[PDB]
Protein backbone atom coordinates (compact mmCIF):
# COMPACT_ATOMS: atom_id res chain seq x y z
CA UNK A 1 0.00 0.00 0.00
CA UNK A 2 1.06 3.65 0.25
CA UNK A 3 3.02 4.23 3.49
CA UNK A 4 2.97 8.06 2.89
CA UNK A 5 0.01 10.47 3.15
CA UNK A 6 0.34 12.94 -0.03
CA UNK A 7 -2.23 15.50 1.16
CA UNK A 8 -0.28 16.06 4.40
CA UNK A 9 2.95 16.19 2.34
CA UNK A 10 1.54 18.83 -0.02
CA UNK A 11 0.14 21.03 2.78
CA UNK A 12 3.39 20.70 4.70
CA UNK A 13 5.32 21.76 1.60
CA UNK A 14 3.13 24.86 1.46
CA UNK A 15 4.01 25.65 5.09
CA UNK A 16 7.72 25.25 4.30
CA UNK A 17 7.28 27.54 1.29
CA UNK A 18 5.65 30.18 3.49
CA UNK A 19 8.52 30.02 5.97
CA UNK A 20 11.12 30.23 3.19
CA UNK A 21 9.47 33.41 1.90
CA UNK A 22 9.30 34.88 5.42
CA UNK A 23 13.02 34.15 5.86
CA UNK A 24 13.86 35.52 2.37
CA UNK A 25 15.47 32.24 1.31
CA UNK A 26 15.12 32.91 -2.39
CA UNK A 27 16.88 29.86 -3.82
CA UNK A 28 15.14 27.58 -1.34
CA UNK A 29 11.80 29.13 -2.36
CA UNK A 30 12.50 28.40 -6.04
CA UNK A 31 13.22 24.73 -5.30
CA UNK A 32 10.08 24.36 -3.17
CA UNK A 33 8.02 26.02 -5.91
CA UNK A 34 9.30 23.48 -8.43
CA UNK A 35 8.59 20.41 -6.31
CA UNK A 36 5.21 21.82 -5.24
CA UNK A 37 4.36 22.25 -8.93
CA UNK A 38 5.23 18.60 -9.62
CA UNK A 39 3.39 17.26 -6.56
CA UNK A 40 0.25 19.28 -7.34
CA UNK A 41 0.24 18.04 -10.93
CA UNK A 42 0.77 14.41 -9.94
CA UNK A 43 -2.08 14.66 -7.39
CA UNK A 44 -4.55 15.93 -10.00
CA UNK A 45 -7.26 13.77 -11.52
CA UNK A 46 -5.48 11.14 -13.60
CA UNK A 47 -8.44 10.99 -16.02
CA UNK A 48 -8.30 14.66 -16.94
CA UNK A 49 -6.92 15.73 -20.31
CA UNK A 50 -3.87 18.01 -20.46
CA UNK A 51 -1.63 19.03 -23.36
CA UNK A 52 2.00 18.30 -24.14
CA UNK A 53 2.69 21.91 -23.12
CA UNK A 54 1.66 20.99 -19.57
CA UNK A 55 3.75 17.82 -19.64
CA UNK A 56 6.82 19.73 -20.84
CA UNK A 57 6.34 22.42 -18.17
CA UNK A 58 6.45 19.73 -15.49
CA UNK A 59 9.51 18.21 -17.16
CA UNK A 60 11.33 21.56 -16.88
CA UNK A 61 10.57 21.70 -13.15
CA UNK A 62 11.93 18.19 -12.78
CA UNK A 63 15.14 19.04 -14.65
CA UNK A 64 15.60 22.19 -12.54
CA UNK A 65 15.41 20.12 -9.34
CA UNK A 66 17.66 17.32 -10.61
CA UNK A 67 20.24 19.74 -12.09
CA UNK A 68 20.55 21.39 -8.67
CA UNK A 69 21.49 18.04 -7.10
CA UNK A 70 23.24 16.20 -9.95
CA UNK A 71 24.85 18.93 -12.06
CA UNK A 72 28.24 17.20 -12.12
CA UNK A 73 26.88 13.81 -13.17
CA UNK A 74 24.15 14.15 -15.80
CA UNK A 75 23.31 16.40 -18.77
CA UNK A 76 19.63 17.14 -19.52
CA UNK A 77 18.30 18.20 -22.93
CA UNK A 78 14.73 19.21 -23.78
CA UNK A 79 13.65 20.19 -27.31
CA UNK A 80 10.14 20.59 -28.70
CA UNK A 81 8.36 21.87 -31.79
CA UNK A 82 5.88 24.49 -30.50
CA UNK A 83 3.06 23.41 -32.84
CA UNK A 84 3.11 19.98 -31.15
CA UNK A 85 2.54 21.32 -27.68
CA UNK A 86 -1.26 21.73 -28.01
CA UNK A 87 -1.52 17.96 -28.47
CA UNK A 88 -4.04 16.55 -25.95
CA UNK A 89 -2.55 13.74 -23.87
CA UNK A 90 -3.12 11.91 -20.56
CA UNK A 91 -1.24 13.55 -17.68
CA UNK A 92 1.84 11.83 -16.28
CA UNK A 93 2.76 10.41 -19.66
CA UNK A 94 6.22 11.98 -19.92
CA UNK A 95 7.41 11.93 -16.30
CA UNK A 96 7.57 8.11 -15.93
CA UNK A 97 9.70 7.95 -19.08
CA UNK A 98 11.98 10.68 -17.83
CA UNK A 99 12.33 9.04 -14.41
CA UNK A 100 13.14 5.75 -16.16
CA UNK A 101 15.88 7.39 -18.23
CA UNK A 102 17.20 9.23 -15.18
CA UNK A 103 17.59 6.01 -13.16
CA UNK A 104 19.29 4.38 -16.17
CA UNK A 105 21.79 7.22 -16.29
CA UNK A 106 22.73 7.65 -12.65
CA UNK A 107 22.95 3.87 -12.15
CA UNK A 108 25.31 3.55 -15.14
CA UNK A 109 27.51 6.63 -14.72
CA UNK A 110 29.43 8.29 -11.93
CA UNK A 111 29.55 11.18 -14.38
CA UNK A 112 28.66 11.35 -18.06
CA UNK A 113 25.00 10.35 -17.99
CA UNK A 114 22.77 11.91 -20.63
CA UNK A 115 18.99 12.26 -20.77
CA UNK A 116 17.33 13.89 -23.79
CA UNK A 117 13.66 14.64 -24.45
CA UNK A 118 12.51 15.55 -27.99
CA UNK A 119 8.97 16.36 -29.17
CA UNK A 120 8.32 16.67 -32.89
CA UNK A 121 5.88 15.98 -35.70
CA UNK A 122 6.42 13.09 -38.07
CA UNK A 123 3.78 12.46 -40.75
CA UNK A 124 0.46 12.34 -38.87
CA UNK A 125 1.94 11.58 -35.42
CA UNK A 126 3.48 13.62 -32.62
CA UNK A 127 6.68 11.86 -31.64
CA UNK A 128 7.95 12.06 -28.06
CA UNK A 129 11.48 10.62 -27.72
CA UNK A 130 13.10 10.05 -24.31
CA UNK A 131 16.68 8.88 -24.72
CA UNK A 132 19.36 7.83 -22.23
CA UNK A 133 22.92 6.63 -22.75
CA UNK A 134 22.64 3.85 -20.18
CA UNK A 135 23.58 0.19 -20.47
CA UNK A 136 20.30 -0.73 -22.20
CA UNK A 137 17.08 -2.05 -20.74
CA UNK A 138 16.66 -5.74 -19.95
CA UNK A 139 15.62 -7.83 -22.95
CA UNK A 140 12.73 -9.56 -21.17
CA UNK A 141 11.40 -6.24 -19.83
CA UNK A 142 11.57 -4.90 -23.39
CA UNK A 143 9.82 -7.97 -24.83
CA UNK A 144 6.95 -7.72 -22.35
CA UNK A 145 6.52 -4.00 -23.08
CA UNK A 146 6.44 -4.72 -26.82
CA UNK A 147 3.85 -7.46 -26.27
CA UNK A 148 1.75 -4.93 -24.33
CA UNK A 149 2.08 -2.44 -27.20
CA UNK A 150 0.87 -5.14 -29.61
CA UNK A 151 -2.15 -5.81 -27.40
CA UNK A 152 -1.05 -9.01 -25.66
CA UNK A 153 -1.50 -8.96 -21.90
CA UNK A 154 1.89 -9.91 -20.40
CA UNK A 155 2.50 -12.28 -17.51
CA UNK A 156 0.83 -11.21 -14.27
CA UNK A 157 3.30 -11.21 -11.36
CA UNK A 158 2.96 -10.51 -7.64
CA UNK A 159 3.89 -7.09 -6.24
CA UNK A 160 3.34 -5.36 -9.59
CA UNK A 161 4.70 5.34 -9.00
CA UNK A 162 3.26 4.95 -12.50
CA UNK A 163 5.44 2.78 -14.72
CA UNK A 164 5.93 2.43 -18.45
CA UNK A 165 3.25 -0.28 -18.61
CA UNK A 166 0.60 2.04 -17.23
CA UNK A 167 1.69 4.90 -19.50
CA UNK A 168 1.33 2.70 -22.59
CA UNK A 169 -2.11 1.39 -21.55
CA UNK A 170 -3.41 4.88 -20.82
CA UNK A 171 -2.18 6.11 -24.20
CA UNK A 172 -3.80 3.19 -26.02
CA UNK A 173 -7.09 3.87 -24.26
CA UNK A 174 -6.87 7.63 -24.75
CA UNK A 175 -6.09 7.60 -28.48
CA UNK A 176 -8.00 4.44 -29.41
CA UNK A 177 -4.96 2.91 -31.12
CA UNK A 178 -2.53 0.30 -29.90
CA UNK A 179 0.73 1.26 -31.66
CA UNK A 180 1.50 4.22 -29.41
CA UNK A 181 5.14 3.49 -28.60
CA UNK A 182 8.30 1.70 -29.59
CA UNK A 183 11.45 0.89 -27.66
CA UNK A 184 14.96 1.09 -29.09
CA UNK A 185 17.63 -0.41 -26.85
CA UNK A 186 20.95 -2.23 -27.12
CA UNK A 187 23.73 -3.26 -24.76
CA UNK A 188 26.06 -0.32 -24.24
CA UNK A 189 24.01 1.90 -26.58
CA UNK A 190 21.32 3.20 -24.23
CA UNK A 191 17.56 3.27 -24.52
CA UNK A 192 15.08 5.35 -26.50
CA UNK A 193 11.39 5.14 -25.63
CA UNK A 194 9.56 6.74 -28.55
CA UNK A 195 5.87 7.63 -28.29
CA UNK A 196 3.90 7.83 -31.55
CA UNK A 197 0.77 9.84 -30.72
CA UNK A 198 -2.02 10.30 -33.31
CA UNK A 199 -1.95 14.02 -34.12
CA UNK A 200 -5.10 15.51 -32.64
CA UNK A 201 -5.62 19.18 -33.58
CA UNK A 202 -7.87 19.31 -30.50
CA UNK A 203 -9.70 16.33 -29.01
CA UNK A 204 -9.53 16.22 -25.22
CA UNK A 205 -12.54 13.77 -24.97
CA UNK B 1 -2.17 3.49 -8.02
CA UNK B 2 0.37 5.94 -6.58
CA UNK B 3 0.57 9.06 -8.80
CA UNK B 4 3.62 10.35 -6.79
CA UNK B 5 7.21 8.98 -6.76
CA UNK B 6 8.35 9.03 -2.88
CA UNK B 7 12.06 8.41 -3.54
CA UNK B 8 12.26 11.50 -5.77
CA UNK B 9 10.24 13.42 -3.15
CA UNK B 10 12.61 12.41 -0.33
CA UNK B 11 15.78 13.24 -2.29
CA UNK B 12 14.28 16.54 -3.40
CA UNK B 13 13.45 17.36 0.23
CA UNK B 14 17.10 16.76 1.06
CA UNK B 15 18.14 19.22 -1.68
CA UNK B 16 15.72 21.82 -0.28
CA UNK B 17 17.15 21.21 3.19
CA UNK B 18 20.67 21.79 1.88
CA UNK B 19 19.63 25.07 0.26
CA UNK B 20 17.83 26.23 3.42
CA UNK B 21 21.02 25.66 5.43
CA UNK B 22 23.12 27.48 2.82
CA UNK B 23 20.70 30.43 3.00
CA UNK B 24 20.61 30.32 6.84
CA UNK B 25 16.82 29.90 6.87
CA UNK B 26 16.72 28.46 10.36
CA UNK B 27 12.96 28.11 10.85
CA UNK B 28 12.54 26.71 7.35
CA UNK B 29 15.30 24.18 8.11
CA UNK B 30 13.50 23.04 11.26
CA UNK B 31 10.26 22.42 9.34
CA UNK B 32 12.06 20.51 6.58
CA UNK B 33 13.87 18.41 9.20
CA UNK B 34 10.53 17.46 10.75
CA UNK B 35 8.85 16.44 7.51
CA UNK B 36 12.00 14.64 6.32
CA UNK B 37 11.94 12.67 9.59
CA UNK B 38 8.32 11.64 8.99
CA UNK B 39 8.86 10.77 5.32
CA UNK B 40 11.97 8.69 6.08
CA UNK B 41 10.12 6.78 8.80
CA UNK B 42 7.08 6.13 6.63
CA UNK B 43 9.33 4.86 3.80
CA UNK B 44 11.06 2.32 6.06
CA UNK B 45 10.32 -1.38 5.96
CA UNK B 46 6.75 -1.79 7.20
CA UNK B 47 7.60 -5.24 8.62
CA UNK B 48 10.35 -3.99 10.90
CA UNK B 49 9.76 -3.72 14.64
CA UNK B 50 10.04 -0.34 16.36
CA UNK B 51 9.07 0.80 19.86
CA UNK B 52 6.42 3.21 21.10
CA UNK B 53 9.28 5.64 21.75
CA UNK B 54 9.86 5.79 17.99
CA UNK B 55 6.15 6.21 17.30
CA UNK B 56 5.88 9.05 19.81
CA UNK B 57 8.96 10.79 18.37
CA UNK B 58 7.29 10.83 14.95
CA UNK B 59 4.08 12.09 16.55
CA UNK B 60 5.97 15.07 18.01
CA UNK B 61 7.34 15.95 14.56
CA UNK B 62 3.81 15.78 13.18
CA UNK B 63 2.44 18.06 15.91
CA UNK B 64 5.28 20.54 15.36
CA UNK B 65 4.41 20.79 11.66
CA UNK B 66 0.65 21.02 12.22
CA UNK B 67 0.98 23.55 15.06
CA UNK B 68 2.96 25.81 12.72
CA UNK B 69 0.07 25.83 10.23
CA UNK B 70 -3.01 25.43 12.47
CA UNK B 71 -2.05 27.05 15.78
CA UNK B 72 -5.24 29.12 15.93
CA UNK B 73 -7.59 26.21 15.24
CA UNK B 74 -6.49 23.07 17.10
CA UNK B 75 -4.89 22.14 20.43
CA UNK B 76 -2.56 19.11 20.55
CA UNK B 77 -1.77 17.11 23.70
CA UNK B 78 0.71 14.24 24.04
CA UNK B 79 1.27 12.38 27.32
CA UNK B 80 3.09 9.10 27.92
CA UNK B 81 4.36 6.94 30.76
CA UNK B 82 8.09 6.46 30.06
CA UNK B 83 8.11 2.78 31.09
CA UNK B 84 5.64 2.08 28.27
CA UNK B 85 7.83 3.50 25.55
CA UNK B 86 10.05 0.41 25.14
CA UNK B 87 6.96 -1.52 24.03
CA UNK B 88 7.67 -3.20 20.66
CA UNK B 89 5.05 -2.31 18.05
CA UNK B 90 4.59 -2.23 14.25
CA UNK B 91 5.64 1.11 12.75
CA UNK B 92 2.95 3.49 11.53
CA UNK B 93 0.53 2.37 14.21
CA UNK B 94 -0.01 5.76 15.84
CA UNK B 95 0.17 8.13 12.86
CA UNK B 96 -3.00 6.86 11.08
CA UNK B 97 -4.94 7.32 14.32
CA UNK B 98 -3.57 10.81 14.79
CA UNK B 99 -4.32 11.76 11.17
CA UNK B 100 -7.86 10.41 11.64
CA UNK B 101 -8.39 12.54 14.75
CA UNK B 102 -6.85 15.56 13.04
CA UNK B 103 -9.25 15.36 10.08
CA UNK B 104 -12.16 14.93 12.53
CA UNK B 105 -11.13 18.11 14.31
CA UNK B 106 -10.43 20.47 11.43
CA UNK B 107 -13.55 19.32 9.57
CA UNK B 108 -15.71 19.97 12.65
CA UNK B 109 -14.20 23.21 13.98
CA UNK B 110 -13.18 26.55 12.57
CA UNK B 111 -11.41 26.87 15.91
CA UNK B 112 -11.65 24.78 19.06
CA UNK B 113 -10.58 21.38 17.78
CA UNK B 114 -8.74 19.14 20.23
CA UNK B 115 -6.54 16.11 19.62
CA UNK B 116 -5.03 14.22 22.57
CA UNK B 117 -2.67 11.23 22.62
CA UNK B 118 -2.14 9.28 25.86
CA UNK B 119 0.08 6.23 26.42
CA UNK B 120 -0.18 4.37 29.72
CA UNK B 121 -0.13 0.98 31.40
CA UNK B 122 -3.34 -0.68 32.52
CA UNK B 123 -3.11 -4.15 34.07
CA UNK B 124 -1.08 -6.21 31.58
CA UNK B 125 -1.68 -3.96 28.55
CA UNK B 126 -0.15 -0.77 27.19
CA UNK B 127 -3.02 1.54 26.36
CA UNK B 128 -2.69 4.06 23.53
CA UNK B 129 -5.62 6.53 23.48
CA UNK B 130 -6.15 8.96 20.58
CA UNK B 131 -9.05 11.29 21.30
CA UNK B 132 -10.73 14.04 19.29
CA UNK B 133 -13.67 16.29 20.10
CA UNK B 134 -15.24 15.92 16.66
CA UNK B 135 -18.81 15.10 15.71
CA UNK B 136 -18.28 11.34 16.15
CA UNK B 137 -17.38 8.71 13.60
CA UNK B 138 -20.04 7.17 11.37
CA UNK B 139 -21.91 4.30 12.99
CA UNK B 140 -21.45 1.90 10.07
CA UNK B 141 -17.71 2.66 9.86
CA UNK B 142 -17.51 1.97 13.60
CA UNK B 143 -19.47 -1.28 13.29
CA UNK B 144 -17.23 -2.59 10.52
CA UNK B 145 -14.10 -1.72 12.52
CA UNK B 146 -15.50 -3.53 15.56
CA UNK B 147 -16.31 -6.57 13.41
CA UNK B 148 -12.70 -6.52 12.19
CA UNK B 149 -11.47 -6.36 15.79
CA UNK B 150 -13.63 -9.39 16.61
CA UNK B 151 -12.11 -11.30 13.69
CA UNK B 152 -14.94 -11.02 11.15
CA UNK B 153 -13.81 -9.91 7.70
CA UNK B 154 -15.99 -6.91 6.77
CA UNK B 155 -17.60 -6.25 3.41
CA UNK B 156 -15.12 -5.93 0.55
CA UNK B 157 -15.72 -2.76 -1.49
CA UNK B 158 -14.12 -1.32 -4.60
CA UNK B 159 -11.45 1.39 -4.32
CA UNK B 160 -10.50 0.34 -0.78
CA UNK B 161 -2.23 6.05 3.17
CA UNK B 162 -2.61 3.34 5.81
CA UNK B 163 -6.03 3.39 7.44
CA UNK B 164 -7.43 2.21 10.75
CA UNK B 165 -8.32 -1.17 9.22
CA UNK B 166 -4.72 -1.88 8.29
CA UNK B 167 -3.44 -0.70 11.68
CA UNK B 168 -5.77 -3.09 13.50
CA UNK B 169 -4.85 -6.06 11.28
CA UNK B 170 -1.13 -5.44 11.68
CA UNK B 171 -1.52 -5.23 15.46
CA UNK B 172 -3.52 -8.47 15.59
CA UNK B 173 -0.86 -10.23 13.52
CA UNK B 174 2.02 -8.70 15.47
CA UNK B 175 0.74 -9.52 18.97
CA UNK B 176 -1.09 -12.75 18.13
CA UNK B 177 -4.32 -11.52 19.76
CA UNK B 178 -7.45 -10.10 18.21
CA UNK B 179 -8.73 -7.70 20.90
CA UNK B 180 -6.16 -4.98 20.22
CA UNK B 181 -8.46 -1.95 20.04
CA UNK B 182 -11.79 -0.46 20.95
CA UNK B 183 -13.63 2.57 19.63
CA UNK B 184 -15.61 4.99 21.79
CA UNK B 185 -17.70 7.46 19.82
CA UNK B 186 -20.98 9.36 20.11
CA UNK B 187 -22.72 12.16 18.24
CA UNK B 188 -21.37 15.48 19.44
CA UNK B 189 -19.01 13.78 21.93
CA UNK B 190 -16.02 13.00 19.72
CA UNK B 191 -14.10 9.81 19.15
CA UNK B 192 -11.55 7.83 21.15
CA UNK B 193 -9.63 5.04 19.46
CA UNK B 194 -8.04 3.04 22.27
CA UNK B 195 -5.34 0.45 21.54
CA UNK B 196 -4.90 -2.36 24.08
CA UNK B 197 -1.44 -3.81 23.40
CA UNK B 198 -0.22 -6.93 25.26
CA UNK B 199 2.63 -5.67 27.45
CA UNK B 200 5.83 -7.10 25.98
CA UNK B 201 8.92 -6.40 28.13
CA UNK B 202 10.88 -7.01 24.91
CA UNK B 203 9.69 -9.16 22.01
CA UNK B 204 10.39 -7.59 18.62
CA UNK B 205 9.96 -10.98 16.76
PT1 LIG C 1 -4.61 16.09 -1.42
PT1 LIG D 1 -3.11 17.63 6.33
PT1 LIG E 1 -4.85 15.66 5.53
PT1 LIG F 1 14.72 -0.25 -17.68
PT1 LIG G 1 13.18 5.67 -1.56
PT1 LIG H 1 15.45 10.56 -7.53
PT1 LIG I 1 14.54 8.00 -7.98
PT1 LIG J 1 -13.98 8.68 11.03
Domain of residue A77, CATH code: 3.30.565.10
Backbone conformation region of residue A57, classed left if phi is above 0, alpha if psi is from -120 to 50, else beta:
alpha
Please tell me the distance from the alpha carbon of residue B116 to that of residue B121, in angstroms, as a whole number: 17
Mapped onto helix, strand or coil, the DSSP state of residue B86 is coil
Please tell me the distance from the alpha carbon of residue A163 to that of residue A156, in angstroms, as a whole number: 15
Closest partner residue to A39 (CB to CB) among B4, B23, B46 is B4
Residue B127: name the closest of B79, B170, B174 by CA.
Answer: B79
Q: Chain A partners of B1 at a C-beta cutoff of 8 Å?
A: 161-162, 166
Please tell me the distance from the alpha carbon of residue B177 to that of residue B198, in angstroms, as a whole number: 8
Please tell me the distance from the alpha carbon of residue B117 to that of residue B77, in angstroms, as a whole number: 6
Q: Report the 10 Å Cβ neighbour count for B99.
A: 21
Q: Where are the alpha helices (DSSP H) in B109-205?
A: 139-150, 164-175
B3/A42 Cβ within 8 A? yes
Residue A57: name the closest of A37, A33, A27 by CA.
Answer: A37
Backbone conformation region of residue B159, classed left if phi is above 0, alpha if psi is from -120 to 50, else beta:
left
φ, ψ of residue B99 to 5 degrees: the values are -65, -40
Q: Report the 10 Å Cβ neighbour count for A84.
A: 20
Same domain flag for B35 and B53: no
Residue A119: name the closest of A175, A168, A60, A40 by CA.
Answer: A60
Kindly state whether residue B169 falls inside one of the protein's structural domains: yes
Closest partner residue to A31 (CB to CB) among B2, B19, B46 is B19
Kindly state whether residue B99 falls inside one of the protein's structural domains: yes
Return the bridge partners of B202, or none: none
Distances (CA, A) of B169 to A158, B151, B164, B166: 21, 9, 9, 5
Return the bridge partners of B74, or none: B113
φ, ψ of residue B96 to 5 degrees: the values are -55, -35
> Mutual orientation of helices A164-175 and A94-108 as an angle, nearest 10°?
150
Return the bridge partners of A193, or none: A130, A183
Mapped onto helix, strand or coil, the DSSP state of residue A199 is coil
Please tell me the distance from the alpha carbon of residue B181 to that of residue B167, in angstroms, as a whole number: 10
Same domain flag for B28 and B55: no
The DSSP call for residue A162 is -
Contact assessment for residue A33 and residue A40, using Cβ atoms and an 8 Å cutoff: no
Distances (CA, A) of B145 to A111, B80, B148, B157, B174: 53, 25, 5, 14, 18
Residue A196: name the closest of A184, A179, A183, A174 by CA.
Answer: A179
> Mutual orientation of helices B52-70 and A6-22 as an angle, nearest 10°?
60
The DSSP call for residue B120 is E
A19/B16 Cβ within 8 A? no
Kindly state whether residue B203 falls inside one of the protein's structural domains: no
Please tell me the distance from the alpha carbon of residue B168 to that of residue A187, in angstroms, as a whole number: 48
Please tell me the distance from the alpha carbon of residue B177 to that of residue B196, in angstroms, as a whole number: 10
Same domain flag for B108 and B189: yes
Q: What's the CA dihedral at B160, A10, B195, B104 to 10 degrees?
A: -80
Q: Report the 10 Å Cβ neighbour count for B152.
A: 9
Method: X-ray
Q: What's the CA dihedral at A42, B11, A163, A56 to 10 degrees?
A: 50
Same domain flag for B51 and B38: no
Please tell me the distance from the alpha carbon of residue A76 to that of residue A80, in angstroms, as a whole number: 14
Same domain flag for B161 and B174: yes
Please tell me the distance from the alpha carbon of residue B18 to that of residue A69, in angstroms, as a whole number: 10
Same domain flag for B39 and B53: no
Q: Chain A partners of B69 at a C-beta cutoff of 8 Å?
A: 11-12, 15
Kindly state whether residue A11 falls inside one of the protein's structural domains: no
Please tell me the distance from the alpha carbon of residue A126 to that of residue A111, in angstroms, as a whole number: 32
Same domain flag for B123 and B94: yes
Query: With 0-12 CB in 10 A as exposed, 13-18 as middle and 19+ as buried, what is A49?
Result: middle
Q: Chain B partners of A42 at a C-beta cutoff of 8 Å?
A: 3-5
Mapped onto helix, strand or coil, the DSSP state of residue B122 is strand
Please tell me the distance from the alpha carbon of residue A98 to that of residue B192, in angstroms, as a whole number: 46
Same domain flag for B194 and B116: yes
Kindly state whether residue A74 falls inside one of the protein's structural domains: yes
Return the bridge partners of A120, or none: A127
Contact assessment for residue A84 and residue A49, using Cβ atoms and an 8 Å cutoff: no
Report the domain count for chain B. 2
Distances (CA, A) of A111 to A11, A73, A103: 35, 4, 13
Same domain flag for B60 and B125: yes
Q: Which domain holds residue A61?
A: 44-198
Return the bridge partners of B76, or none: B115
Q: Chain B partners of A160 at a C-beta cutoff of 8 Å?
A: none
Contact assessment for residue A48 and residue A95, using Cβ atoms and an 8 Å cutoff: no
Same domain flag for B14 and B101: no
Distance of CA A135 to the CA centre of its chain: 19
Mapped onto helix, strand or coil, the DSSP state of residue B8 is helix
Pairing status of strand B88-89 against strand B50-51: antiparallel
Residues 6+ apart with CB under 8 A from B165: B145, B148, B154
Q: What's the longest Cα–Cα distance across chain B? A: 55
Residue B145: name the closest of B194, B197, B81, B105 by CA.
Answer: B194
Whole-number Å distance, alpha carbon B77 to ligand 3 midpoint, is: 18
Q: What's the longest Cα–Cα distance across chain A? A: 55
Q: Report the 10 Å Cβ neighbour count for B48.
A: 11
Kindly state whether residue B205 falls inside one of the protein's structural domains: no
Q: Is B42 on the interface with A (CB under 8 A)?
A: yes
Same domain flag for B162 and B192: yes
Ordered DSSP codes for B16-66: HHHHHHHTT-HHHHHHHHHHHHHHHHHHS-TTS-EEHHHHHHHHHHHHHHH
Please tell me the distance from the alpha carbon of residue A184 to that of residue A167, in angstroms, as a whole number: 17
Please tell me the distance from the alpha carbon of residue B167 to that of residue B92, in angstroms, as a whole number: 8
Kindly state whether residue B83 falls inside one of the protein's structural domains: yes
Work out the end-to-end distance of chain B between its first and last CA atoms, rounded to an integer number of angstroms: 31
Closest partner residue to A16 (CB to CB) among B31, B95, B161 is B31
In what helix (H) or strand (E) does residue A77 lie, and over which residues does it extend?
strand A74-80
Same domain flag for B15 and B112: no
Kindly state whether residue A50 falls inside one of the protein's structural domains: yes
Distance of CA A202 to the CA centre of its chain: 22
Resolution in units of Å: 1.8
Residue B38: name the closest of A69, A13, A159, A29 by CA.
Answer: A13
Amino acid sequence: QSQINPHFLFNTLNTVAKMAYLEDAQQTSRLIEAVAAILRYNLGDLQRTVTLADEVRIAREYFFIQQTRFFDRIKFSLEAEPSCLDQPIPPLTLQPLIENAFIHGIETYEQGAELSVSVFAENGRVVVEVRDNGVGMDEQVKAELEALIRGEEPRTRREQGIGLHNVIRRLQLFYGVMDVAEIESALGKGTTVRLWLPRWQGGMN
